[PDB]
Each structure stands twice: as structure tokens, then as C-alpha cells.
């Protein structure tokens, strides 16, 4: 059964058990994700701020069935337009809230790209998405306030396309990450 992680520990305890096998069930990791409450002191090794715009950080390489990692922001901060590799996308947040602007892919026409929905992702709730529902951008609305979130990917991937809100225009982007295990990689 699906138990409640007191701690990030925990919580990577039970992950580990999820992608035990070969596929993956959403329902149970969006609810355990969820059910982690955020605890500050917890994963602050993992929470690297850059003044300019958003970092990746990794926290876990899931024995290879997924990179668990964290994304801190910075007043102001958010993403391009971009979709997530053929794999499966947990976000959860950690500290603050999140805007996702959601967006279908995009037709042929060089036309611009309006939104198909929107919404704020508060502290420590866990949203989902994959190529097959759609896009999305995300940004962390705040002048004065920085927001962290947990994400979860399976299969891992560090390329992805960003996509032109004016023309539906992509590009091939192959990320990086600043930090692995709580130090610093340049
Ligand atoms: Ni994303």
C-alpha cells in the first residue's frame, strides 16, 4: 500500500518501491508526492539559488528509472514553452507557488501559440503532465518571494524542445544540471 513520507527521506524510500518495475502508476505517485509535506531543513542542500534565472538540482538518480531533482526561483523566474521527452513529469512544490501556462502543440502555420489553460500550483500540491495531454510553461509570478519545487521524471531526460509563443517555432535544448547530490557542477 501507498504509506505517507514524514520526511524527504521517506519519501524517496517509497519512490524507489513505485518504480520498482517497468511501467508506472501516475495516480500513486502524484498522491505519495502530495502526501511528502515539505520540510525546509530537508532538502536545503539541494536548493541552490542563481540570481539570473532557474537551476536544476539533482537529488536522486532513481537506480536509473528516474531523476528526482529540485528547482529553485527566483523572484520572477519561470521556463520557455516546452514539452517533457516522451516520459512522465511530476512537479510538486516545496516553497511558494507556481504559474503553469498550458498550450497545445502546435499545428504547422508559423501562427502564434495562444494559452489553452492556467492556473497557480501552490505549496505542496503535485500537478502531472506528458507530451500526449500538451505544453506548458512554467513561472514563478513573485516580485519579492522565491519558490521551490520537487520534480520527478521517468524515463530520465535532459533534452527538450522549447517552443516560440508567437510562431509555435521549437528548438532542441539539452539541459544541464548545477548541482548533483548537494554540490555544485560546473
Ligand atoms: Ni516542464
Redesign the pocket.
Known sequence: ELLKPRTLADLIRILHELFAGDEVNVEEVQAVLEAYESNPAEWALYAKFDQYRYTRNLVDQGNGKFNLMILCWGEGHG?SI?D?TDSH?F?KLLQGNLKETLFDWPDKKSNEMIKKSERTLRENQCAY?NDSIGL?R?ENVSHTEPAVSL?LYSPPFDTCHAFDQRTGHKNKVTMTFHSKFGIRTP
Open positions: 521556463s516546452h517533457h513529469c512537479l503532465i506548458h512554467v520534480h
